[PDB]
Write a protein that binds this ligand. Structure first.
Ligand SMILES: Nc1ncnc2c1ncn2[C@@H]1O[C@H](COP(=O)(O)OP(=O)(O)OP(=O)(O)O)[C@@H](O)[C@H]1O
Ligand SMILES: Nc1ncnc2c1ncn2[C@@H]1O[C@H](COP(=O)(O)OP(=O)(O)OP(=O)(O)O)[C@@H](O)[C@H]1O
Ligand SMILES: Nc1ncnc2c1ncn2[C@@H]1O[C@H](COP(=O)(O)OP(=O)(O)OP(=O)(O)O)[C@@H](O)[C@H]1O
Ligand SMILES: Cn1c(=O)c2c(ncn2C)n(C)c1=O
Ligand SMILES: [Ca+2]
Ligand SMILES: [Zn+2]
Ligand SMILES: [Zn+2]
Ligand SMILES: [Zn+2]
Lengths: 33, 746, 146, 48, 48, 49
């Protein structure tokens, strides 16, 4: 539930199994990595 | 009809079925012993096939734990003799048919005339250890001195396909219906060759029939079906469709795109069936490596048709050859040189290999032009009809269901809408669409309400009276319609791939006019493989934001240019000659051009080219101006543009990976995650192979298309009616057969 | 073994033995293998770089050819774009590593009838190569290592 | 982060009902469930 | 990563209780439920 | 694969492996299918009797 797939579009920091919702530049759609 | 099934179960049908199985097995044995009763044998298995069809119909709607399957297993164990004997007969026949194709049997034949002695056949069977002694004797008795193994094997193989399929379906349905049955498990273990042989030809599509209950549907798969399914055109089209639909993210409409893709694949299947029959060495090494990694009256008419079919078959090979030819000619173009006078600038070819480069380049250009012409012809012959079918299907569906062309209007813009309105008057509108009577359907649907005359006039029907007479019946140049041809040409001239082909043809013609124009043909390397196409799509992915940032950069540069003209004009001295100084900021246009030419790509601000203000006035002001220009141009705006492009590329690659990951963890039909199926070993693999396979669904749909409506079963008729109603509620929609009956299956 | 054996012939051959430090540590091995992790995409990006350099080279050869003068003395002018191969080598040697486009090495186009055309050419070359292709390769390597 | 916040607001409105505390997952089972739930009832324009 | 970790510390403090760790969704059923919890139930100052 | 095919008939193939009778197992498994003749030749099986 709270955990999300690897490259799933997450919402904020943590809230995922990879626990890092970093974004690769000047764009939206933060994803877990 | 639950009542009829219950009445049949409670009646004395079962004793009749036992007796029928017994007499039919004995008849089958007796006719197998004989040879002149092949017609009676064919009638017997046709009737056996019908009897199994009735048995499956009775088994339709049977719950995981129901009395019907209990009576099935009770009668199966009651009459195990005859049914076991006939299943053994089928097993040995299929085993012999498989053995005759193996090297074990071919290593014992001694007569070149295709004959082998009975004793030698018995020895071969004993060596194979497949048939028992009584089984070997029975097979010998069945065969007509020569044993004629091939003819005897293939005489009964074709008739027995239907009955073997029916019995395989029957046993599969019982095994899936009531697990944990020792008698059923033993009976399934008795016959395994038949199930293995019929496994690739058997489907296990699961649909929701009624009362939100998941049911198993078994349909027919032909050899030609899987034979044509293995082509890479259909696989590539499926990959593109699934990738696009997963990027789209649509859930409610996902089944709609799935059905559209299935229809497009069926149309492509039909079209495929129709068309079925020094520095030079270093530069050379680099080009070779790049190419290697990149690579990783009636008689005339029939001849033209055959040539077009052959060209259509090898379209991808032709495109690869064209790309290779372009690479070769541009590599040849890499050996050019300019001299003041020929051996007014003159473009003369380098001698290289004793002047062999010029005729080679000429022949390469001619061959490339010819191959490009054949490529556009093949594209028109191959992929254009699919686009025509899709457009006609969309227009007919919209007019039939949405009704926005009669009740409503297309509205402003919508060039495709105006084009579709133009072809509405054209006769034979569903030329490629399967349903050629969509006009009559929409007539009977809404035209009478909207006016029997106005609707008919808008639809451009030939004559209502003529159509009624045809329904109540109980040269080439004139046949072709100019309006349909012009509409087809117009809709062809709007497809992106046809525009690319036309651009390629124009570039080839320009290269013929001037050899240096051939460099544009290497732009096809972007479309060839997906990474460069991803880069190109990233270039325009955020076009609005990119143009907005470019506009901000332009206005900032304009403001700073105005400031520099107003105050910092003295320092703009690019020329170092005091006798004839050059003022780069004497005018707005010149200063703005200098700024946009040097200050944006300097990498350290405009101050690198501007003279040092330390020895002049306004030193602090100019230093602050340079610092803020650098910070607000290179550090901020250029970095923002670069980040936009790079993150667009990264997001595109991220989506391309995420689609694959989601498909590997979630299935397309019901979307249940693989975590639930992970408990069963290889549960997700079995689910995606048999339960919710797209190929199985499409095979079932087009088999129902092939099979007549009268022969449809209750579930098949229901699914066909739902398909005709343009409403898909029979899909699992997150319901699994194992999940529905988890308690009973455990 | 063969590098150690050849080190006797020339002492400088022993410098190849420093690759043990790259193949030994996990971090060094990861850094070395980052290139091969996404090698196909990197080679494809290099292919686009070569293709765009070829296109801009033939464009400069067709016109703005006179601006390719890298000789300070007018007694012996040097035309770096007199041939396809020489101009391509000059482009692949200077423009990609310049960091500000091909206009840095080329003289300032002042007073020429093609001033706007040359300016647009330099702008698109810079934007297409340095801002996009080099950054794409750098981001690919960084993402592979990450 | 600013662009992400804007897209975040857009996606949250495309998902959240803006009136009740239940996401679109419950209404996803019924076709057009979220559209019907946000069209007639739980509408800010309707409340105004 | 360091700035992200500090912000995440702040966000986890604002979202998850330090004492019990129950998520804010459980207390979101009642208005100002998390505020009441953090001011009366599991306050570190109260334990002090 | 071709390298492994070359070593199949080597007498010392079972070396360095605990299962030194794998030739016997494969011969027993495939004797019915292949007549116990081609399998023995492929695996060597010198002096099977
Ligand atoms: N409904 C589905 N039908 C088929 N495959 C599915 C489905 N849902 C997910 N998959 C996944 O698709 C794969 C099987 O189909 P697919 O054709 O993509 O296989 P592949 O091994 O990638 O080979 P290729 O695409 O070259 O045929 C598996 O990875 C499977 O998990
Ligand atoms: N409680 C809510 N009230 C209204 N809209 C809501 C609510 N919750 C979510 N939404 C979403 O916000 C949308 C309303 O804004 P919308 O995007 O439709 O505006 P618009 O672009 O001006 O209109 P149009 O759809 O006609 O172009 C709804 O369609 C829905 O997707
Ligand atoms: N068990 C807990 N007890 C108290 N606060 C907690 C607890 N768990 C989490 N928190 C959070 O910690 C914060 C309480 O400290 P806070 O950051 O408000 O202090 P402050 O800003 O220094 O003080 P002030 O109240 O003077 O503004 C709140 O955001 C609260 O939600
Ligand atoms: C006969 N037929 C087709 O030929 C066909 C089709 N869908 C696509 N095609 C091509 N359908 C539903 C159909 O019944
Ligand atoms: Ca019927
Ligand atoms: Zn599924
Ligand atoms: Zn609500
Ligand atoms: Zn707490």
């Amino acid at each position: 539930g709270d955990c999300l797939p690897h490259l799933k579009r997450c919402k904020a920091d943590n809230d995922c199994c990879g626990k890092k919702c970093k974004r690769r530049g000047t764009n939206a759609e933060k994803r877990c990595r | 009809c639950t009542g009829n099934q219950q009445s049949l179960a409670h009646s004395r049908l079962w004793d009749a079925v036992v007796g029928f199985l017994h007499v039919f097995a004995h008849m089958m044995m007796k006719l197998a012993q004989d040879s002149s009763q092949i017609e009676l044998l064919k009638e017997l298995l046709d009737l056996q096939k019908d009897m199994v069809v009735m048995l499956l119909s009775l088994l339709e709607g049977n719950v995981v734990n129901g009395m019907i399957a209990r009576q099935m297993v009770d009668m199966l164990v009651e009459s195990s003799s005859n049914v076991e004997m006939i299943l053994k007969f089928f097993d040995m026949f299929l085993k012999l048919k498989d053995i005759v194709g193996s090297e074990a049997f071919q290593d014992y034949v001694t007569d070149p005339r295709g004959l082998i002695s009975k004793k030698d056949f018995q020895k071969a069977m004993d060596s194979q250890k497949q048939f028992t002694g009584p089984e070997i004797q029975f097979l010998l008795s069945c065969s007509e001195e020569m044993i004629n193994f091939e003819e005897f094997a293939n005489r009964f193989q074709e008739p027995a396909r239907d009955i073997g399929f029916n019995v395989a379906v029957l046993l599969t349905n019982l095994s899936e219906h009531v697990p944990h049955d020792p008698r059923l498990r033993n009976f399934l273990e008795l016959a395994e060759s038949i199930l293995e042989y019929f496994r690739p030809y058997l489907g296990r599509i699961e649909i929701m029939g009624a009362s939100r209950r998941i049911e198993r549907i078994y349909f027919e798969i032909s050899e030609t079906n899987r034979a044509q399914w293995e082509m890479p055109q259909v696989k590539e089209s499926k990959r593109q469709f699934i990738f696009d639909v997963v990027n789209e993210g649509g859930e409610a409409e996902k089944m709609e795109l799935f059905v559209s893709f299935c229809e497009d694949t069926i149309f492509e299947m039909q079209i495929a069936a129709q068309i079925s029959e020094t520095a030079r060495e270093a530069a050379t090494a680099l080009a070779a490596l790049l190419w290697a990694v990149v690579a990783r009256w009636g008689e005339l008419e029939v001849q033209r048709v055959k040539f077009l079919n052959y060209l259509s078959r090898n379209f991808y090979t032709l495109r690869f050859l064209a790309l290779f030819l372009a690479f070769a000619i541009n590599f040849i173009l890499l050996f050019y040189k300019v001299s003041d006078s020929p051996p007014n600038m003159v473009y003369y070819f380098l001698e290289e290999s004793t002047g062999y480069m010029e005729p080679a380049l000429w022949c390469l250009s001619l061959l490339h032009t010819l191959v490009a012409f054949l490529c556009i012809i093949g594209y028109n012959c191959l992929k254009v009809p699919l686009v025509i079918f899709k457009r006609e299907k969309e227009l007919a569906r919209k007019l039939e269901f949405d009704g926005l062309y009669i009740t409503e209007q297309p509205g402003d813009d919508d060039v495709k809408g105006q084009w579709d309105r133009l072809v509405l008057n054209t006769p034979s509108f569903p030329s490629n669409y399967w349903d050629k009577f969509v006009k009559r359907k929409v007539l009977d649907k809404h035209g009478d309400i909207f006016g029997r005359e106005r609707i008919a006039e808008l639809l451009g029907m030939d004559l209502a009276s003529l159509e009624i007479t045809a329904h109540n019946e109980r040269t080439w140049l004139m046949s072709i319609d100019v309006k349909y041809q012009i509409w087809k040409f117009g809709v062809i001239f709007t497809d992106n791939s046809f525009l690319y082909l036309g651009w390629y043809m124009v570039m080839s013609l320009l290269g013929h006019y001037n050899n240096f124009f051939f460099a544009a043909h290497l732009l096809d390397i972007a479309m060839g493989v997906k990474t460069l196409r991803t880069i190109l799509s990233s270039v325009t992915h955020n076009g609005k934001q990119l143009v907005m940032t470019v506009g901000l950069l332009a206005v900032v540069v304009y403001l700073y240019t105005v400031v520099a003209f107003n105050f910092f004009r003295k320092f703009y001295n690019k020329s170092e000659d005091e006798d004839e100084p050059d003022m780069k900021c004497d005018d707005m246009m010149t200063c703005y051009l200098f700024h946009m030419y040097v200050g944006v790509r300097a990498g350290g601000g405009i101050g690198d080219e501007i003279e040092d203000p330390a020895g002049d006035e306004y030193e602090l002001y100019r230093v602050v101006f340079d610092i803020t220009f650098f910070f607000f141009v290179i550090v901020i705006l250029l970095a923002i543009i670069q980040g936009l492009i790079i993150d667009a590329f990264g997001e595109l690659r991220d989506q391309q990976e995420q689609v694959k990951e989601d498909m590997e963890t979630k299935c397309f039909i019901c979307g249940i995650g693989s975590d639930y199926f992970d408990t069963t070993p290889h549960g997700f693999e079995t689910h995606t192979l048999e339960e919710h396979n797209l190929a199985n669904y499409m095979f079932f749909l087009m088999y129902l298309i092939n099979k007549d409506e009268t022969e449809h079963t209750g579930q098949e008729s229901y699914v066909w009616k739902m398909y005709q109603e343009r409403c898909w509620d029979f899909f699992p929609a997150g319901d699994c057969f194992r999940k529905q009956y988890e308690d009973q299956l455990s």
